[PDB]
Amino acid sequence: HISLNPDLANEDEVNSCDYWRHCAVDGFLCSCCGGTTTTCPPGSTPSPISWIGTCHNPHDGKDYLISYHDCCGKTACGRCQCNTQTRERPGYEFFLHNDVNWCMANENSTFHCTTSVLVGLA
Amino acid sequence: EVNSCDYWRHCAVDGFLCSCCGGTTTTCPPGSTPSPISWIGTCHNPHDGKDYLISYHDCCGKTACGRCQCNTQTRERPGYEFFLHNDVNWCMANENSTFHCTTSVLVGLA
Amino acid sequence: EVLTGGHSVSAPQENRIYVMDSVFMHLTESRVHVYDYTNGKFLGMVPTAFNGHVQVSNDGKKIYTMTTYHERITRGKRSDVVEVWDADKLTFEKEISLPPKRVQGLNYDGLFRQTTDGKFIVLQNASPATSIGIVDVAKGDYVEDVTAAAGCWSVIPQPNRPRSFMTICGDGGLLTINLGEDGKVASQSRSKQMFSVKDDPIFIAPALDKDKAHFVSYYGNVYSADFSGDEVKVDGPWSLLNDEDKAKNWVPGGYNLVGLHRASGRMYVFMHPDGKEGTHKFPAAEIWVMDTKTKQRVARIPGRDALSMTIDQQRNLMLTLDGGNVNVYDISQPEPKLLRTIEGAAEASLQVQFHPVGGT
Amino acid sequence: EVLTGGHSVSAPQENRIYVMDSVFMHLTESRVHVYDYTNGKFLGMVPTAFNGHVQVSNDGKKIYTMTTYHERITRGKRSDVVEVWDADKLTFEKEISLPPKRVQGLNYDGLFRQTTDGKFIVLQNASPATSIGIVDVAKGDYVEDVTAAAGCWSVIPQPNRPRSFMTICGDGGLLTINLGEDGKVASQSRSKQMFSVKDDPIFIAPALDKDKAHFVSYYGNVYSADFSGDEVKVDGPWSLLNDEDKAKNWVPGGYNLVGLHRASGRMYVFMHPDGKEGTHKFPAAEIWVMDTKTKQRVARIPGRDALSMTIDQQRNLMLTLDGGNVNVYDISQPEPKLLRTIEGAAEASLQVQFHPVGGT
Ligand SMILES: *NC(=O)Cc1ccc(OC)cc1
Numbered sequence A: 001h002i003s004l005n006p007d008l009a010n011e012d013e014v015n016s017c018d019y020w021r022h023c024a025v026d027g028f029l030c031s032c033c034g035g036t037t038t039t040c041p042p043g044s045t046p047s048p049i050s051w052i053g054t055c056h057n058p059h060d061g062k063d064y065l066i067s068y069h070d071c072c073g074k075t076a077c078g079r080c081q082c083n084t085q086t087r088e089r090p091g092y093e094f095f096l097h098n099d100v101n102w103c104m105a106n107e108n109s110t111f112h113c114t115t116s117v118l119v120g121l122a
Numbered sequence B: 001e002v003n004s005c006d007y008w009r010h011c012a013v014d015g016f017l018c019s020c021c022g023g024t025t026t027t028c029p030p031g032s033t034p035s036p037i038s039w040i041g042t043c044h045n046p047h048d049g050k051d052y053l054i055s056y057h058d059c060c061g062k063t064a065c066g067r068c069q070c071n072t073q074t075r076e077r078p079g080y081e082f083f084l085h086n087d088v089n090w091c092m093a094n095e096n097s098t099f100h101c102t103t104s105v106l107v108g109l110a
Numbered sequence C, D: 001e002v003l004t005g006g007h008s009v010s011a012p013q014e015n016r017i018y019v020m021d022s023v024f025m026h027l028t029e030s031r032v033h034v035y036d037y038t039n040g041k042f043l044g045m046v047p048t049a050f051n052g053h054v055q056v057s058n059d060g061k062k063i064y065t066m067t068t069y070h071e072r073i074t075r076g077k078r079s080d081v082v083e084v085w086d087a088d089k090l091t092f093e094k095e096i097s098l099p100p101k102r103v104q105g106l107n108y109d110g111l112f113r114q115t116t117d118g119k120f121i122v123l124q125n126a127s128p129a130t131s132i133g134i135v136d137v138a139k140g141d142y143v144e145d146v147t148a149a150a151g152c153w154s155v156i157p158q159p160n161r162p163r164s165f166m167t168i169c170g171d172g173g174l175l176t177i178n179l180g181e182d183g184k185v186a187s188q189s190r191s192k193q194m195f196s197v198k199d200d201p202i203f204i205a206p207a208l209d210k211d212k213a214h215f216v217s218y219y220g221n222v223y224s225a226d227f228s229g230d231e232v233k234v235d236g237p238w239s240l241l242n243d244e245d246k247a248k249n250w251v252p253g254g255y256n257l258v259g260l261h262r263a264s265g266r267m268y269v270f271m272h273p274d275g276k277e278g279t280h281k282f283p284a285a286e287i288w289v290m291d292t293k294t295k296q297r298v299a300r301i302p303g304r305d306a307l308s309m310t311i312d313q314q315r316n317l318m319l320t321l322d323g324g325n326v327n328v329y330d331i332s333q334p335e336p337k338l339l340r341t342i343e344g345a346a347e348a349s350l351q352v353q354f355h356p357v358g359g360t
């Protein structure tokens, strides 16, 4: 199931804002920043909180819950900036909202990069 | 013409021209603080054909202006001739050393 | 010659605008750039550290910023603050300590506001639990934390009351908070449901009148909140769209995406065609000019890829902003007229504001 | 899936290079970008606040940075520091306090160096009075100023001695400092005049051998300092230029503009035509390769507008850097061979360095 396993996929594909699971990313993809889709770059810290939502996987035709945790405590990665907004909603639906820094409750809130963690089927 | 890097008085500016930053050639933008120290340049005046000493005091205590960046090096020398050298932050001795912009103050004839 | 400091901004307050540059690529060095809208001249700037927010005091005398510091930037103790700066000298005057939960996010107007009388700053917190924080400007103190606003978002001041504001809640209604002269909650009320959160979510940006506010939705509907009385009365939807518009799937998009010209009732909205799920922050293909009384469009003009706007009532001006460039429009007549574009006003700005001239 | 941290750099040390990005446009958010030179992959980064400097420990285990903080960035108390970071985890370990006069300036190698034995960090101070600062790495302490270096600039370690270095002084000579085991000055010596400061100023960047250093001048001459013996012996000039070169006014230009391949004696230098007063920091039209034994040019290749370089003796490589892009060259033969270009490695970098391999 390569479509569910970014580490087995082509890097150019996962590093693209159009990669299916990045459908509500506002930020720099961690996979372009010395990390991977599910690992923070060295010396940056996962956020315990995140915005969430669902993305369609066109490879297997199913919808998946994605959790958009940030990596924190280093200054902006600067690479692979995305601003995708599928099913994103404003702050009165706070955990669907991506115009806030999901590093906000980390020991250091400086935003480094963001990613898309697969939680499960929607 | 004063906002151009080719203006004659700017012949040893490495930084942002304060005149593009809400200041002028001889005044710091509001809320930025003059440096008491500076590098000095000797620049040729294209009108009277004389050389003049220009003191490149920085304005300090605000983050980078970002406008009218210049890197001109007429008669600039390395740090072993320290007060002729422009690869150092002449805000280094200010209460706040953050570099905002560079002025071009006419001292007099060289 | 002698280099001097201590100077004031070189143009009158009435010429000044404030472009909040997030500098997202280097978000620890955000700043406010001050420009003269009449000629595009850069007048000065205020440094605002990590993800600064900004507003100018209603009396025009001071600039307020909100930001976060750490002892060593990326490590060490956090300090969330409001800072008071002199508007004319662009100098720091005082720091007001906040609890370490001020909103870190893009620069929507409604995250950092003030009461109409200018005596209290009203700001959004997220820990991620939400609440509204109240700063007493005169005392220089954080004086109230409105936990009644949990699950709500953003601050819409009521221009017809001295210390009242509203917030948009997860029930699709509005919570109104009326502060006492001490900045503590003096009373509150909750409206009936205005919009369906699930079926027709609104953009948070108000098109704000003296006694009412309008909101546009993801699907191009308009909702209104009338606060001429103590209890807010809500209504809507009416559609921005006619049948032709619907055929090309026109919808709103942007950030600070609407504005109201109070004398005429004209509402300005950034719109783009081929709307679908995920296009709510798309740049404007057009600006539409709506008559809020007749509930019909009166004009449409090119949008110049704008994302955010603001209105000056007394000079009849609209600014628009595409992230980097500021367009200046005369809106004294129903069709806006483009006067100039200030190129390179910011690297990454979603908010521009005029210096207030209307006093308190 | 679960997001985790705590990870090490993905590529081995021998693949790594460090691009010091000043981010001059936003100089308070300077940083080190870590790249794999073999494939251009971005591996990680280290934040370095205002005008960071960087080096890697001689033993390859740690990254040393030097920077300035203030309590509120643009106001409040100043802290100049050295920081020790783990090379493989890219995490902060220790802050070493410096007096508030560490050099703020562009990233010449010689502003932030270490003794050959790795026991002392040796850095340039400017208050603007100059001195050299000594940091005891084992103790995590600042030792004391080397005030003997007043009126001198930059640090050239002597690779044939454990804790000795030289500096270039305003008299056109070199001062040698020999530290004791505690990092204080044990002895010193001053060479005869090597170059005329007025008539033939040299660039500070050494082409450094194990027991000698070469320097190039604004007018394309070469000077040498031999420190094989008890005291430093100086000589020069010899010209880089033949008659044809002189006729077209070829001169050196750049920042970290020279390098030495120690095994062959080949010296690498950035050069440009039409030299005159004010062109000493111009980008390279060409790279010239000089045999320092025969004093002849053995190759010339396109400069790719490079400004700074570095040499790896263990893999026979040269990197060049034009401010944003890093070129990787094989220099195992007299003519360098271009292997690849890493595009967008920095916004404003004048220094790149290899992760050390071996070098005992
Ligand atoms: N995914 C988000 O955490 C990215 C982001 C958006 C807005 C911020 O503050 C301006 C920071 C980070």
Ligand SMILES: *NCCc1ccc(OC)cc1
Pocket: B014, B015, B056, B058, B086, B087, B088, B089, B090, B099, B102, D022, D051, D104, D105, D106
């Ligand atoms: N006027 C000099 C401006 C300057 C140069 C270098 C530097 O350090 C990176 C800061 C300011």
